[PDB]
Amino acid sequence: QFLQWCTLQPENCAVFTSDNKEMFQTESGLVVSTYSMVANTRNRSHDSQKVMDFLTGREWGFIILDEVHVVPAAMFRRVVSTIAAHAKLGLTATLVREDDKIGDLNFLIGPKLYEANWMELSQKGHIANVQCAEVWCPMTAEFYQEYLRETARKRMLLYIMNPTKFQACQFLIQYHERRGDKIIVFSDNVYALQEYALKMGKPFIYGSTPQQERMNILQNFQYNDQINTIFLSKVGDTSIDLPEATCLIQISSHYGSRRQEAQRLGRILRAKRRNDEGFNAFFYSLVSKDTQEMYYSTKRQAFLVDQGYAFKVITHLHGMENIPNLAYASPRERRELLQEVLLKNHPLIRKMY
Amino acid sequence: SLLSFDQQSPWLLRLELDRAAMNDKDLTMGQVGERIKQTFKNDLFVIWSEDNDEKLIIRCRVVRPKSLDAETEAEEDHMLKKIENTMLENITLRGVENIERVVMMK
Amino acid sequence: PRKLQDLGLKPASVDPATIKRQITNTHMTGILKDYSHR
Amino acid sequence: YATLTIDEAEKRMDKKSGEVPRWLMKHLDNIGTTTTRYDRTRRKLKAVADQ
Amino acid sequence: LLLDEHNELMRQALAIKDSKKRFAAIWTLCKTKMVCETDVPSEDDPTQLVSRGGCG
Ligand SMILES: [Mg+2]
Ligand SMILES: [Zn+2]
Numbered sequence A: 001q002f003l004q005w006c007t008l009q010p011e012n013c014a015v016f017t018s019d020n021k022e023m024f025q026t027e028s029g030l031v032v033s034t035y036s037m038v039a040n041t042r043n044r045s046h047d048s049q050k051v052m053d054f055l056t057g058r059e060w061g062f063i064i065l066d067e068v069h070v071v072p073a074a075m076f077r078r079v080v081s082t083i084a085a086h087a088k089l090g091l092t093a094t095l096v097r098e099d100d101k102i103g104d105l106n107f108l109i110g111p112k113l114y115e116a117n118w119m120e121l122s123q124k125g126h127i128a129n130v131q132c133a134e135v136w137c138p139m140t141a142e143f144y145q146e147y148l149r150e151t152a153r154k155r156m157l158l159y160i161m162n163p164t165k166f167q168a169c170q171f172l173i174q175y176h177e178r179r180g181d182k183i184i185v186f187s188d189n190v191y192a193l194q195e196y197a198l199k200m201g202k203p204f205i206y207g208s209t210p211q212q213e214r215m216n217i218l219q220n221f222q223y224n225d226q227i228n229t230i231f232l233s234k235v236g237d238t239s240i241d242l243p244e245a246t247c248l249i250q251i252s253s254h255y256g257s258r259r260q261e262a263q264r265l266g267r268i269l270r271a272k273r274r275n276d277e278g279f280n281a282f283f284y285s286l287v288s289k290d291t292q293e294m295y296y297s298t299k300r301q302a303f304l305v306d307q308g309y310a311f312k313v314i315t316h317l318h319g320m321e322n323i324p325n326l327a328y329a330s331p332r333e334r335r336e337l338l339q340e341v342l343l344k345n346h347p348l349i350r351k352m353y
Numbered sequence B: 001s002l003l004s005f006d007q008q009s010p011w012l013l014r015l016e017l018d019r020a021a022m023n024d025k026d027l028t029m030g031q032v033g034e035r036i037k038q039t040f041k042n043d044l045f046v047i048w049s050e051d052n053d054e055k056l057i058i059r060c061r062v063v064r065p066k067s068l069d070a071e072t073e074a075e076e077d078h079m080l081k082k083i084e085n086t087m088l089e090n091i092t093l094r095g096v097e098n099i100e101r102v103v104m105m106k
Numbered sequence C: 001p002r003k004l005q006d007l008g009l010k011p012a013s014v015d016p017a018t019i020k021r022q023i024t025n026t027h028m029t030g031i032l033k034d035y036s037h038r
Numbered sequence D: 001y002a003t004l005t006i007d008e009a010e011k012r013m014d015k016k017s018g019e020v021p022r023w024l025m026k027h028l029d030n031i032g033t034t035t036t037r038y039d040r041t042r043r044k045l046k047a048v049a050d051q
Numbered sequence E: 001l002l003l004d005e006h007n008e009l010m011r012q013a014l015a016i017k018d019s020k021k022r023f024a025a026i027w028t029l030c031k032t033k034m035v036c037e038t039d040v041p042s043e044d045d046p047t048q049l050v051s052r053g054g055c056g
Helices: A046-057 A077-082 A100-108 A119-123 A141-149 A152-160 A163-178 A190-200 A211-223 A258-268 A293-300 A302-307 A331-342 A348-352 B019-024 B029-039 B076-089 C002-007 D006-013 D024-031 D037-049 E008-014 E019-030
Strands: A013-015 A030-032 A063-066 A088-091 A130-138 A183-186 A229-232 A247-250 A281-289 A312-314 B013-017 B044-048 B056-062 E039-041 E049-051
Touching (some): A077 A100, A130 A163, A130 A258, A141 A331, A163 A183, A163 A190, A163 A281, A163 A331, A183 A258, A247 A258, A258 A281, A258 A293, A281 A293, A293 A302, A348 B076, B029 B044, B029 B056, E008 E019
Parallel strands (some): A013 A030, A063 A088, A130 A281, A130 A312, A183 A229, A247 A281
Antiparallel strands (some): B044 B056, E039 E049
């Protein structure tokens, strides 16, 4: 995007990532890297060791801190100090975090300059409209019994894999797929992502996925009609451009964070067809009723409410019964799943061998 | 009695040494034994008789690894011949290379 | 060509020496089509 | 003793391995290759008597 | 010549005074190159290539 929008020649632009670490030899140039590639102190590669000296030796003129909501974290702020720059800028959609370090940005890069409304841009055609919803899926009795006795650490996995969520997701996916909508399913738990993906036979991406494979998956999901839905995880929570994505679903969450909810929603806010008449994006949040998810759900969506988004409670999904088949529809499958999830917790002697 | 051996290979290599040959050059079984034991640091276990014995013999056994090799049994004796030949040629018991003999003169 | 050029006549040819002869999620083995470029 | 073939013998002579296995014939006997006429005829005769 | 002055090894070879030993040095280096190298890396840095008289 950098090259597309400006007239900078590719020769003067250098990329500093894990694949390639070469640095520009020009008098003036641009370096695009990640904080983890510059905040490391103990150990660095020989190729990276020269790059670290290359960054430190020169006196830069401007530093752009993309996603500046993580610069006040433990150590990414070191790049701001180690890297010499006469001006510092911060870019983040959500200027909030659980701790009080958010205020540290004032003396790190300066105060907040400008802010923009969300609903104002929605009505002006700049961004798409979202029909936010929250589905309350009552956990089945058999699983709920283990929920009471089980410890907090294991409790999370129990109500995230309840059979009701599987059936609701299948009906929504089929209904939305029939409508020609691109669906993204977020899940912080890797095990749930794999189980959902393999059960539904859909691609999934998470931490272990390599850069090459995921890039091919993302390109296929954008332009390939056969692949209309994917299964992303916390890795794709933010900073990945999906101009084609329109629908968004989430099954798991990272407790009470109010930024992840907004960051995840951003995947469908840059949809290409955000100006055609009557278009409204969808954001479904599957939460198990009568569980701690409501405490986190009501606490992790407070930021979006302030912006202007309103979540709609959906107690019933019409037409769910008429669907031909649903996962874990019989008690036998539910019992099998219950135990499955529960069980989760001398150089010449060289010829000898 | 004075003293791993469970997996020691049943095959044995026996070397007989001449006292008249070993007293021409001042050597003891201690230095030659450790020289063999240090050539292969701990691969093979060896025992040497004392000088007081009527005949000087060193018994050597190669210990197989934890994994059992069935294909090596056919060449097990062949491997012993291989090490036996090397143990005679490329072993520098003591001295400097390329020095075949030395004579004292006045 | 060099001799003709020395004479000043246009050489309708050139010396031939100047002719410069110039994986995770493996449950979708074959569904993925390679959309590498656009 | 079920001699080998010219192609097999030539391959073994070449540097396919440091030395021929001591029990190469035994290993190939189990596989069924490199049999004898007596064994070759007996199995065929038995294959007919069975029907 | 297959190898020009842009190569550090050649610079040493071209510095030999006597023709006989100098000739031997050049042959040992040039005989192993199987391409004219119309473009050769610049001596200042290996990033950009400096054009050299060649045919490829
Ligand atoms: Mg961004
Ligand atoms: Zn040439």
